[PDB]
Amino acid sequence: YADSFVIKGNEVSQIAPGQTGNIADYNYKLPDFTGCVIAWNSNKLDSK
Amino acid sequence: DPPEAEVQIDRLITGRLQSLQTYVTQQLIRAAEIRASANLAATKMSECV
Numbered sequence: 001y002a003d004s005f006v007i008k009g010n011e012v013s014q015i016a017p018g019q020t021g022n023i024a025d026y027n028y029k030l031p032d033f034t035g036c037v038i039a040w041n042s043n044k045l046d047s048k
Numbered sequence: 049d050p051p052e053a054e055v056q057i058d059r060l061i062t063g064r065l066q067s068l069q070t071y072v073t074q075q076l077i078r079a080a081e082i083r084a085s086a087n088l089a090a091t092k093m094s095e096c097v
Binding site: 017018019020032 | 050052054
Protein backbone atom coordinates (compact mmCIF):
# COMPACT_ATOMS: atom_id res chain seq x y z
CA TYR A 1 0.00 0.00 0.00
CA ALA A 2 0.96 3.67 -0.22
CA ASP A 3 -0.89 6.06 2.10
CA SER A 4 -0.15 9.69 1.26
CA PHE A 5 -1.35 12.51 3.51
CA VAL A 6 -0.13 15.86 4.84
CA ILE A 7 0.60 16.44 8.54
CA LYS A 8 2.24 19.22 10.52
CA GLY A 9 5.99 19.12 11.04
CA ASN A 10 5.84 18.65 14.81
CA GLU A 11 3.33 15.80 14.33
CA VAL A 12 5.51 13.72 11.99
CA SER A 13 6.96 11.94 15.03
CA GLN A 14 3.43 10.74 15.84
CA ILE A 15 3.34 8.78 12.54
CA ALA A 16 4.85 5.64 14.07
CA PRO A 17 3.54 2.42 15.65
CA GLY A 18 2.36 2.64 19.24
CA GLN A 19 2.25 6.43 19.56
CA THR A 20 -0.62 8.60 20.78
CA GLY A 21 -1.83 12.07 19.89
CA ASN A 22 -4.35 14.02 17.87
CA ILE A 23 -3.01 12.70 14.57
CA ALA A 24 -2.14 9.21 15.82
CA ASP A 25 -5.31 8.37 17.77
CA TYR A 26 -8.05 10.11 15.76
CA ASN A 27 -6.66 10.50 12.22
CA TYR A 28 -4.20 7.70 11.39
CA LYS A 29 -3.35 4.77 13.67
CA LEU A 30 -0.53 2.42 12.72
CA PRO A 31 -0.59 -1.16 14.04
CA ASP A 32 1.60 -1.89 17.04
CA PHE A 33 3.91 -2.89 11.63
CA THR A 34 6.13 -3.85 8.69
CA GLY A 35 6.90 -0.99 6.33
CA CYS A 36 8.77 2.24 5.74
CA VAL A 37 7.58 5.70 6.78
CA ILE A 38 8.77 8.52 4.51
CA ALA A 39 8.29 12.21 5.33
CA TRP A 40 9.78 15.19 3.48
CA ASN A 41 8.98 18.76 4.49
CA SER A 42 6.97 20.55 1.79
CA ASN A 43 6.34 24.24 2.50
CA LYS A 44 6.96 25.56 -1.02
CA LEU A 45 3.92 23.75 -2.45
CA ASP A 46 1.54 23.98 0.55
CA SER A 47 2.32 27.01 2.72
CA LYS A 48 0.91 30.30 1.46
CA ASP B 49 2.86 3.39 25.76
CA PRO B 50 2.10 0.03 24.09
CA PRO B 51 5.67 -0.13 22.71
CA GLU B 52 7.16 0.92 26.05
CA ALA B 53 4.97 -1.51 28.00
CA GLU B 54 5.80 -4.52 25.82
CA VAL B 55 9.51 -3.95 26.52
CA GLN B 56 9.01 -3.94 30.30
CA ILE B 57 6.52 -6.83 30.26
CA ASP B 58 8.96 -9.29 28.67
CA ARG B 59 11.21 -8.53 31.64
CA LEU B 60 8.43 -9.83 33.90
CA ILE B 61 7.57 -12.77 31.64
CA THR B 62 11.21 -13.86 31.40
CA GLY B 63 11.72 -13.20 35.11
CA ARG B 64 8.78 -15.38 36.15
CA LEU B 65 9.43 -18.11 33.58
CA GLN B 66 12.89 -18.59 35.09
CA SER B 67 11.18 -18.49 38.49
CA LEU B 68 8.90 -21.38 37.51
CA GLN B 69 11.63 -23.43 35.83
CA THR B 70 13.86 -23.08 38.89
CA TYR B 71 10.94 -24.37 40.97
CA VAL B 72 10.08 -27.36 38.78
CA THR B 73 13.73 -28.34 38.32
CA GLN B 74 14.18 -28.51 42.10
CA GLN B 75 10.96 -30.50 42.57
CA LEU B 76 12.26 -33.11 40.13
CA ILE B 77 15.47 -33.37 42.15
CA ARG B 78 13.59 -33.62 45.46
CA ALA B 79 11.16 -36.21 44.10
CA ALA B 80 14.11 -38.32 42.95
CA GLU B 81 15.32 -38.64 46.55
CA ILE B 82 11.84 -39.25 47.95
CA ARG B 83 11.50 -42.11 45.47
CA ALA B 84 14.89 -43.38 46.63
CA SER B 85 13.68 -43.30 50.24
CA ALA B 86 10.32 -44.80 49.21
CA ASN B 87 11.97 -47.73 47.44
CA LEU B 88 13.93 -48.39 50.64
CA ALA B 89 10.83 -48.27 52.84
CA ALA B 90 9.14 -50.78 50.54
CA THR B 91 12.18 -53.04 50.90
CA LYS B 92 12.15 -52.77 54.70
CA MET B 93 8.45 -53.61 54.72
CA SER B 94 8.97 -56.65 52.51
CA GLU B 95 12.02 -57.96 54.39
CA CYS B 96 11.96 -56.64 57.96
CA VAL B 97 8.19 -56.80 58.43
